[PDB]
Amino acid sequence: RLFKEGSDVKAGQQLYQIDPATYEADYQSAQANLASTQEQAQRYKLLVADQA
Amino acid sequence: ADGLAARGTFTEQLQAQRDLVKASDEYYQLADKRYRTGVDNYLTLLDAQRSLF
16 A cells, blocks of 8 residues: 555555556566567568568 | 471461460569559569569
8 A cells, every 4th residue: 555544645646556467467468469560560661662 | 298297387386385475474464463553562573574584
């Protein structure tokens, strides 16, 4: 718990932490797939100008 | 008689070869249409040119 109780908080201030541990794992999966699809898109962008 | 046999058969042979050349030209024009549209890359068109040649 990351707030002093009975105090004024701001909009967007972090209150708790709910142990990600699975939301980290699927984020690692999505970042791992993005790291290859972005590379293939960046290579095909260079090859499309030479009609290869 | 050998020359008469050659005169008899070379007309059909050259008609068949000229039809083969015309069909290869039509295949090259179709591959060029698929390249200009954007479905085929340039290596397929270069593969069709030497098949015409």
